[PDB]
Scaffold this active site. Structure first.
Site, mmCIF file in Angstrom:
data_model
loop_
_atom_site.group_PDB
_atom_site.id
_atom_site.type_symbol
_atom_site.label_atom_id
_atom_site.label_comp_id
_atom_site.label_asym_id
_atom_site.label_seq_id
_atom_site.Cartn_x
_atom_site.Cartn_y
_atom_site.Cartn_z
ATOM 1 N N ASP A 1 0.821 -1.259 0.274
ATOM 2 C CA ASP A 1 0.164 -0.053 -0.112
ATOM 3 C C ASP A 1 0.994 1.128 -0.023
ATOM 4 O OD1 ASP A 1 -2.220 1.611 -0.066
ATOM 5 O OD2 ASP A 1 -3.006 0.816 1.835
HETATM 6 P P1 ZMP Z 1 -2.497 5.380 0.349
HETATM 7 O O1 ZMP Z 1 -3.495 5.660 -0.844
HETATM 8 O O2 ZMP Z 1 -3.062 4.116 1.267
HETATM 9 O O3 ZMP Z 1 -2.179 6.450 1.307
HETATM 10 C C1 ZMP Z 1 -2.154 6.289 2.628
HETATM 11 C C2 ZMP Z 1 -2.789 7.425 3.552
HETATM 12 C C3 ZMP Z 1 -2.316 7.462 4.986
HETATM 13 C C4 ZMP Z 1 -2.128 8.588 2.813
HETATM 14 C C5 ZMP Z 1 -4.037 7.491 3.793
HETATM 15 O O4 ZMP Z 1 -4.684 6.733 2.404
HETATM 16 C C6 ZMP Z 1 -5.055 8.789 3.771
HETATM 17 O O5 ZMP Z 1 -5.154 9.695 3.027
HETATM 18 N N1 ZMP Z 1 -5.598 8.858 4.874
HETATM 19 C C7 ZMP Z 1 -5.602 10.076 5.598
HETATM 20 C C8 ZMP Z 1 -4.659 10.760 6.041
HETATM 21 C C9 ZMP Z 1 -3.904 10.160 7.300
HETATM 22 O O6 ZMP Z 1 -3.977 8.967 7.475
HETATM 23 N N2 ZMP Z 1 -3.710 10.950 8.336
HETATM 24 C C10 ZMP Z 1 -3.129 12.307 8.255
HETATM 25 C C11 ZMP Z 1 -1.908 12.461 8.364
HETATM 26 S S1 ZMP Z 1 -1.305 13.188 9.998
HETATM 27 C C12 ZMP Z 1 -1.166 11.851 10.965
HETATM 28 O O7 ZMP Z 1 -1.444 10.539 10.814
HETATM 29 C C13 ZMP Z 1 -0.111 12.255 12.131
HETATM 30 C C14 ZMP Z 1 0.128 10.988 12.894
HETATM 31 C C15 ZMP Z 1 0.698 11.104 14.149
HETATM 32 C C16 ZMP Z 1 2.083 12.002 13.988
HETATM 33 C C17 ZMP Z 1 3.275 11.224 12.986
HETATM 34 C C18 ZMP Z 1 3.661 9.893 13.725
HETATM 35 C C19 ZMP Z 1 4.940 10.110 14.405
HETATM 36 C C20 ZMP Z 1 4.789 10.351 15.927
HETATM 37 C C21 ZMP Z 1 6.029 10.147 16.569
HETATM 38 C C22 ZMP Z 1 7.095 9.090 16.272
HETATM 39 C C23 ZMP Z 1 7.854 8.787 17.538
HETATM 40 C C24 ZMP Z 1 8.426 9.889 18.141
HETATM 41 C C25 ZMP Z 1 9.281 9.791 19.433
#
Ligand code: ZMP
Ligand code: PC1
Ligand code: 3PE
Ligand code: 3PE
Ligand code: 3PE
Ligand code: NDP
Ligand code: SF4
Ligand code: SF4
Lengths: 115, 82, 441, 185, 130, 337, 133
Positions: free
Chosen positions: B39
């Site tokens: 994916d």
């Molecule tokens: P493909 O067509 O399958 O595309 C996959 C995605 C994910 C783009 C989806 O199809 C999609 O468009 N869905 C909606 C968007 C989404 O999934 N989320 C919005 C993005 S912001 C987000 O998800 C933030 C997550 C938390 C912060 C980042 C992660 C890391 C956190 C800290 C890590 C470790 C630190 C110590």
């Protein structure tokens, strides 16, 4: 004015879903690119595979969002959490607070007290 | 670099990835999504893994273009690092 | 809200309404010497956006455990050698949720919180909260309370400036003036501890006047102190004003222009140092200020030296105001004469029924403040201290927001400091007179 | 910047003075530069401080001054007969700004309205005096005592047994402070 | 044996005796956070072993040569009675050339560290209407 | 595990589970808790809201323990082994008594026999005197009344004394322990440990101290562990040479040792221990253990009987040895070789 | 202290007391006795002294502590009253419930105050009574 910091990104709205689609991939890429660099900054004793697993799961919880204005709040939070992590403003306890290293049945929950 | 050299290491990495449907489907002209069952996030991890192995940085504009093994091979030859 | 789910019209942004400068009269690429090649991107080869995100300047955590931090500041400095290229102050290390805790208190119960914001200027912080509630209460506090609040308002101003100016001199390396001035403030906390029961957190100034009346020997002892405080100002004036090491550590340091100081939300000496005549006690007279004469010190170069000369003048102007208050102190009550607002005398509460009912209701329910909101501002010793209080019509505030002068000042730190040396940053922390109880709240 | 209306009279600064317009003599200017003159004055001012009485007191043999209104540790007080003055109205529990007071009451064996529990968390208290302000019967007071530092925090959780004992010990000052400060309350 | 030789010994044994006491009679309980760098309570990037700008190194170069110059003047100070006038002239010729290179360092602002953190030149004229 | 615990004397304990503000309902006494193991059992009991009595000797070395629990939870009692009253005052409010008192080397007032046999005698006799439910005494690995090493013999006789007086004793035999402040990994990374009698070739199954504190916590809740004997050892066998190899790979230092013949070193070691006041690591018997090898005595319960699977020492070398990496190699990732 | 004062005070009190005062107060003070605590503490006054130094205490115990001062005298040493507990009427109200002995700060000793619940539990469980079958 005062200078924006090293990873400071201007807060802008997603133009369309294609914009949001490309930004979310850019944010996920930038996180998993930095996992080796997080490990030695914060002296993580786990291997980088676990760190990238946790990044994947954080992104997966927002998988099923079909609203541009909810995604852009989410793209905001990750930008600030990325900037906060890379500039080493947070410390090891904060980064380890992020890694957790409920009862699985009714009967298990019942017997121990609620959970 | 050598084309066969910059392809042999990809097959080991791609087969080494945990949850591809089957290691036989990797060819010189195989697609991550249609064939290898990866994916969006799995594909971004695959370009990330390829860049780490070749010790090169793949920019956001051309990182998206790599949706197939052949595109990875052409970019690796195009970028002068190994 | 609903329309934001899918793509719609983009919300207009300041970048959109940007306008191109006219080329006939435009002269220069930089009318400000703050951005005149004393920031980041003045060295190296490539910018820190692409291919530069892999390198760092020499970055040092100036605080929190640092003397010049004066407490609980985490000022992340990026040094080019011994020069500051970028300053990122990190605050919230004394954030304790004061503004949320005020929402689960009666208006009386929230007043001690204001003692602990700028915690060298307790009675002044009390006044701005007491003047906002009194405005929403639509009551007029008696003349004796107004003269007590202006006199203890200027005793507080002197107490703050002793801590502020002499802490600032201590950072630059001058130790002795700090010791002399802390006997004077030790003298002035007797006046606090004689009218209230506390050296520091008096809880004295309250909506409706003051808690108790001054004791019968206090005015004479304040006047006795007043007859010698001029000599105290002069001997600290005697070690710093002409000192050539003092002049070359502050003159030309932390320079902010008049037009930028307003745009930076600067108030007080930070604003008056730049040449603007502005005093909140002159422009919106509160309490008994419009009944006294005082001068307003205004600098002309907008640097640490002019700000020092303006604050040393306010010592002399505060002592001048205090003398007039001692002379003009009227008789009468120190509490608004309404027991539905202010607590009745203990004698009356033990003697009469309507006094007991009112004492009981004021200490359990509190008094109700008529609904509405207000912004109230006073000339605090550190600048325009303000409060935005929203009223439900009930006995607990719906919203208490504190506008702290030092919050607005620490934000303009990188604007005025980038390009100076590490010692010059120490100089600018003390001239900008920060207490992080008000910064973080 | 400046007030609207006519600009302040003479608000514009005079034109800058040139090097040869400064009316200081060269002998004075050069003398002051090389002789370090202004800083010798500062050195001298320290000298006369050296020959002034110090401000220091010898704590604990000497104590700094405190007033009748001073707010120290809490004490529960009694009437001249030894009856507790506390009647369990709970007013101080209500007005507390830090929720440091926990009170439980009942009718006593003789039908009297008296507390069964009376606790002050001395690590939650803010020492504002609001509780003694509100008392209808002068029961809860803050003593003039500030020296009660302890080895543990459990020693700072005062029950009714500790607070009555405090009043039983400190009553002569508590009475003299109330006497001296009552008319102003 | 000579006073100087024993003097060197005693100062070194004192440096040892003080050091030995602390190495023996003090508790030693080393742990990870006790053994970290001090950074005011927050851990930061470890970058004290990477090249660092020195804004006063031109001072270090000129300090190197003016030391050689004042050392070359010390034999004259202890030989003046024999040097006399003829030897004085050479000492002045030497110090004059050394001083010219010093005027070169003051003139060019080589001993200046630049640090801080120019008026209008556009005059408009009004001819009025066309 | 449940909200109700019922003890051997039959008293019930209605518990509220989480946090330091809750009710763990257990009153424990942990003798020897100011050592290395003792904090992990005390933190585990205290942070789940249990009252813990901590008998101590030196006041300043007990202080890190109070942070573990809420107000009134951790109670310090000042005691001596040869002060029976202070022992009896410390166990008489308790439903579990942990005996973690041991010493590797003799002292001028305690022999290994005096601290192990007699110390256990007083502690167990008070456990019997006041009828305390549970008694988890910690012995050592290789404990044997027929042993010739003073350590393995004296801790083997105290085992029999405890059972003879209080038969429901849970006897716990840990292997050599590693952890933070362990005398295993931190000595191999140190510079004082240069002398040695064997070639660091003795073998044992090292066990994480964190997993031993967890094991002692689970023995309190698994009542069926009473009267049992537990050997708590790690997943692999190593020599001192294999462990020291891991340490060098981690700190990047390549430590070295001076080997001595035992008829020569052992007499000296008995002199250093008798002439220095601090724990020197060297003594006649510690040299004798140095030549001995660990045997896991069968018919003894294991970590699996607590439902626990110990982790290997290799996974822990980076975490605990990083303070000892030189600056040049400090920023490097864990070895994971 | 200064030479005129120190010699003048030394002449008045004697060499033996001078060295005792250099051991506890570290100063050389002379004044007239105003009274004695129930604990043996001695109080002096001298208005011819620097401000806040006109009143001081000679502590009875060697291991002197500020909490060894009796309550009424704690106000006099603090300039909270001017009349000393010798002449102060409130020290005459007879209270049979008042501590007869000296009750100081008891921390760091085994007499340290231990807090407790003064109230009974809030819910009482059934005492089981298994009636015969
Ligand atoms: P493909 O067509 O399958 O595309 C996959 C995605 C994910 C783009 C989806 O199809 C999609 O468009 N869905 C909606 C968007 C989404 O999934 N989320 C919005 C993005 S912001 C987000 O998800 C933030 C997550 C938390 C912060 C980042 C992660 C890391 C956190 C800290 C890590 C470790 C630190 C110590
Ligand atoms: C003088 C003689 C000094 C040597 C005496 C022999 C040592 C006996 C005690 C040994 C145990 C000490 C101990 O455990 O302390 C714990 C602690 C430290 O013990 P530790 O075991 O934590 O130390 C760890 C470091 N190693 C591993 C190297 C041991 O010691 C102290 O804090 C103080 C020790 C004693 C020091 C006393 C003051 C020294 C200066 C004396 C000046 C001259 C005095 C002359 C008069 C003397 C009296 C008549
Ligand atoms: C004896 C009695 C005194 C005993 C006590 C001595 C004083 C002890 C004080 C503590 C140590 C001295 C501290 C020095 C502080 C002065 C200083 O360093 O400031 C630097 C200052 C900067 O000078 P600059 O910026 O270049 O020029 C304009 C200045 N507004 O530079 C200056 O301000 C100039 C300082 C001048 C010092 C030079 C030495 C003076 C001696 C005479 C020199 C002879 C040559 C000149 C001949 C006279 C010509 C008329
Ligand atoms: C009359 C003879 C001239 C005496 C020197 C006068 C002087 O002080 O000028 C110093 C000179 C100023 O030059 P400048 O930087 O251009 O001044 C600002 C205007 N542009 O500064 C300079 O740049 C000239 C270079 C330094 C000259 C100083 C020489 C001193 C050397 C020691 C001499 C004693 C041996
Ligand atoms: C100074 C007065 C004398 C100092 C104390 C002498 C009395 C004494 O007992 O010395 C023997 C002492 C015993 O040391 P010990 O603690 O028993 O050995 C265990 C450490 N591995 O061993 C020692 O010698 C301590 C070193 C001194
Ligand atoms: N750690 C290991 O590798 C192994 C440990 N064990 C056993 O496990 C137990 C705990 O181990 P660990 O915590 O590492 O050991 P430590 O030596 O670090 O702790 C031992 C404890 O015993 C106390 N103690 C020792 N002698 C006396 C005495 N004479 N009187 C009173 N108290 C005394 C100590 O108190 P104080 O600090 O005040 O002296 C200390 O709290 C010990 O019994 C040990 O023998 C067994 C096998 C392996
Ligand atoms: S306010 Fe005073 S009288 Fe009323 S309950 Fe509280 S302590 Fe007792
Ligand atoms: S003085 Fe203390 S106990 Fe009394 S109301 Fe204030 S915080 Fe509560």
């Amino acid at each position: 004015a005062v200078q924006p910091t090293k990873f400071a990104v201007t807060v802008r709205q997603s133009r369309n879903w294609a914009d949001a689609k490309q930004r979310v991939i850019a944010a996920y890429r930038a996180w998993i690119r930095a996992a080796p660099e997080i490990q030695t900054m914060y002296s993580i004793p786990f291997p980088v595979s676990h760190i990238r697993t946790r990044i994947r799961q954080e992104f997966e919880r927002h998988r099923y969002v079909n609203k541009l204005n909810v995604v852009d709040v989410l793209l905001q939070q990750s930008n600030a959490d990325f900037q906060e992590t890379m500039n080493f403003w947070r410390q090891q306890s904060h980064v380890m607070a992020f890694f957790k290293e409920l009862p699985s049945n009714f009967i298990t929950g019942f017997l121990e007290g609620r959970n | 670099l050598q084309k066969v050299e910059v392809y042999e290491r990809i097959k080991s990495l791609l087969a080494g990835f945990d949850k591809v449907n089957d290691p036989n489907n990797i060819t010189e002209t195989a697609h991550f999504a249609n064939d290898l069952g990866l994916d969006s996030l799995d594909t971004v991890e695959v370009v990330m893994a390829i860049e780490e192995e070749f010790s090169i940085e793949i920019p956001d504009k051309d990182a998206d273009q790599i949706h197939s093994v052949d595109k990875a091979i052409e970019y690796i030859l195009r970028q002068p690092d190994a | 809200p609903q329309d934001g789910f899918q793509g719609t019209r983009l919300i207009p942004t300041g970048a959109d309404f940007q306008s191109p400068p006219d080329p006939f009269i435009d002269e220069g690429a930089r009318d400000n010497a703050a951005n005149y090649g004393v920031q980041k991107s003045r060295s190296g080869v490539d910018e820190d956006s692409v291919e530069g995100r892999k390198v760092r300047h020499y970055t040092v955590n100036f605080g929190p455990q640092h003397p010049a931090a004066h407490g609980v500041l985490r000022l992340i400095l990026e040094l080019n050698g011994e020069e500051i290229v970028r300053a990122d102050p990190h605050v919230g290390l004394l954030h304790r949720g004061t503004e949320k805790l005020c929402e689960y208190k009666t208006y009386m119960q929230a007043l001690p919180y204001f003692d602990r914001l700028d915690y060298v200027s307790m009675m002044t912080n009390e006044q701005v909260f007491s003047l906002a509630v009194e405005k929403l209460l639509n009551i007029e506090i008696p003349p004796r309370a107004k003269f007590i609040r202006t006199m203890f308002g200027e005793i507080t101003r002197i107490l703050n400036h002793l801590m502020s100016v002499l802490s600032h001199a201590m950072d630059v390396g001058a130790l002795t003036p700090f010791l002399w001035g802390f006997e004077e403030r030790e003298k002035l906390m007797e006046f606090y501890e004689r009218v209230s029961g506390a050296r520091l957190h008096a809880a004295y100034v309250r909506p409706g006047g003051v808690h108790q009346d001054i004791p019968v020997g206090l005015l004479d002892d304040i006047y006795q102190w007043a007859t010698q405080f001029g000599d105290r100002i002069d001997e600290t004036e005697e070690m710093l004003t002409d000192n050539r090491i003092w002049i070359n550590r502050l003159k030309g340091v932390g320079v902010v222009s008049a037009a930028d100081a307003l745009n930076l939300s600067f108030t007080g000496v930070m604003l008056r140092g730049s040449g603007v005549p502005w005093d909140v006690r002159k422009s919106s007279p509160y309490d008994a200020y419009d009944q006294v004469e005082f001068d307003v010190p205004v600098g002309i170069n907008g640097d640490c030296y002019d700000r020092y000369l303006c604050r040393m003048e306010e010592f002399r102007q505060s002592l001048r105001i205090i003398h007039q208050c001692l002379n003009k102190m009227p008789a009468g009550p120190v509490r608004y004469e309404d027991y539905k607002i202010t607590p009745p005398p203990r004698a009356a509460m033990k003697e009469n029924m309507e006094a007991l009912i009112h004492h009981f209701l004021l200490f359990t329910k509190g008094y109700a403040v008529p609904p509405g909101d207000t912004y109230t501002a006073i000339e605090a010793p550190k600048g325009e201290m303000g409060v935005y209080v929203v009223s439900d019509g009930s006995e607990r505030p719906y919203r208490v927001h504190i506008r702290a002068p030092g919050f607005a000042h620490l934000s303009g730190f990188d604007h005025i400091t980038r390009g100076h040396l590490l010692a010059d940053a120490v100089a600018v922390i003390g001239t900008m007179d920060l207490v992080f109880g008000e910064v973080d709240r | 910047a400046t007030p609207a209306g006519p600009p302040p009279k003479n608000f514009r600064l005079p034109p800058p003075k040139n090097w040869d317009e400064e009316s200081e003599s060269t002998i004075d200017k050069v003398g002051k530069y090389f002789l370090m003159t202004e800083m010798l004055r500062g050195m001298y001012v320290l000298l006369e401080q050296f020959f002034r009485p110090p401000y220091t007191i010898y704590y604990p043999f000497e104590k700094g001054p405190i007033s009748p209104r001073f707010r120290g540790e809490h004490a529960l007080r009694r009437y001249p007969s030894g009856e507790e003055r506390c009647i369990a109205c709970k007013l101080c529990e209500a007005v507390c700004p830090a929720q440091a007071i926990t009170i439980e009451a009942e009718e006593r064996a003789d039908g009297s309205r008296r507390t069964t529990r009376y606790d002050i968390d001395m690590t939650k208290c803010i020492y504002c005096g609001f509780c003694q302000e509100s008392c209808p019967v002068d029961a809860i007071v803050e003593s003039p005592n500030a020296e009660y530092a302890t080895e543990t925090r459990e020693e700072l959780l005062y029950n009714k047994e500790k607070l009555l004992a405090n009043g039983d010990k400190w009553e002569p000052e508590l009475a003299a402070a109330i006497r001296a400060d009552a008319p102003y309350r | 044996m000579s006073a100087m030789s024993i003097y060197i010994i005693f100062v070194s044994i004192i440096a040892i005796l003080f050091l030995a006491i602390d190495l023996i009679f003090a508790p030693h309980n080393p742990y990870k956070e006790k053994l970290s760098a001090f950074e005011c309570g927050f851990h930061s990037f470890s970058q004290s072993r990477s090249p660092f700008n020195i804004s006063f190194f031109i001072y270090g170069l000129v300090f190197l040569l003016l030391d050689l110059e004042i050392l070359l003047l010390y034999p004259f100070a202890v030989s003046e009675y024999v040097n006399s006038a003829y030897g004085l002239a050479a000492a002045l010729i030497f110090i004059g050339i050394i001083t010219i290179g010093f005027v070169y360092e003051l003139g060019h602002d080589a001993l200046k560290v630049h640090s801080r953190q120019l008026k209008s030149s556009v005059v408009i004229s009004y001819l009025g209407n066309i | 595990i449940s909200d109700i615990h019922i003890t051997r004397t039959g008293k019930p304990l209605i518990r509220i589970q989480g946090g330091r503000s809750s009710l763990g309902e257990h009153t424990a006494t942990v003798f020897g808790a100011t050592g290395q193991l003792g904090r992990y059992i005390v933190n585990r009991l205290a942070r789940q809201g249990c009252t813990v009595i901590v008998p101590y000797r030196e006041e300043m070395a007990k202080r890190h323990l109070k942070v573990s629990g809420d107000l009134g939870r951790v109670i310090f009692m000042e005691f001596d082994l040869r002060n029976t009253q202070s022992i009896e005052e410390s166990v008489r409010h308790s439903d579990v008594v942990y005996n973690l008192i041991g010493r590797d080397y003799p002292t001028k007032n305690f022999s290994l026999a005096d601290v192990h046999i007699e110390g256990t005698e007083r502690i167990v006799e008070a456990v019997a005197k006041y009828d305390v439910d549970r008694f988890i005494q910690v012995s050592t690995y290789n404990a044997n009344p027929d042993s010739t090493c003073e350590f393995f013999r004296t801790k083997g006789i105290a085992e029999k004394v405890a059972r003879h007086v209080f038969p429901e004793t849970t006897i716990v035999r840990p292997a050599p322990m590693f952890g933070f402040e362990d005398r295993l990994l931190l000595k191999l990374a140190s510079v004082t440990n240069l002398f040695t009698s064997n070639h660091m070739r003795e073998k044992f199954w090292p066990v994480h101290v964190n997993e031993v504190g967890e094991a002692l916590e689970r023995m309190l809740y698994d009542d069926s562990t009473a009267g049992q004997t537990f050997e708590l050892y790690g997943p692999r066998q190593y020599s001192m040479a294999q462990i020291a190899e891991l340490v060098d790979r981690e700190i990047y230092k390549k430590r070295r040792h001076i080997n001595l013949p035992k008829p020569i070193l052992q007499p000296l070691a008995e002199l250093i221990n008798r002439v220095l006041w601090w724990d020197t690591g060297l003594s006649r018997d510690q040299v004798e253990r140095e030549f001995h090898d660990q045997v896991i005595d069968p018919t003894a319960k294991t970590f699996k009987d607590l439902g626990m699977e110990p982790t290997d020492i290799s996974k822990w070398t980076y975490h605990y040895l990083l303070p000892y990496r030189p600056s040049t190699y400090y920023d490097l990732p864990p070895s994971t070789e | 202290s200064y030479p005129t004062r120190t010699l003048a005070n030394l002449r008045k009190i004697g060499l033996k007391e001078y060295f005792r005062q250099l051991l506890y107060i570290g100063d050389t003070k002379y004044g007239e006795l105003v009274g004695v605590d129930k604990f043996g503490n001695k109080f002096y006054e001298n208005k011819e002294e620097l401000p806040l130094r006109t009143r001081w205490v000679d502590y009875a115990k060697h291991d002197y502590d500020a909490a060894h001062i009796e309550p009424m005298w704690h106000a006099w040493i603090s300039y909270q009253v001017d009349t000393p507990p010798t002449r102060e009427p409130l020290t005459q109200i007879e209270r049979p419930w008042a501590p007869k002995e000296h009750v100081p700060n008891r921390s760091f000793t085994r007499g340290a105050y231990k807090p407790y619940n003064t109230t009974q539990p809030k819910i009482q469980s059934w005492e089981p009574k298994a009636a015969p079958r």
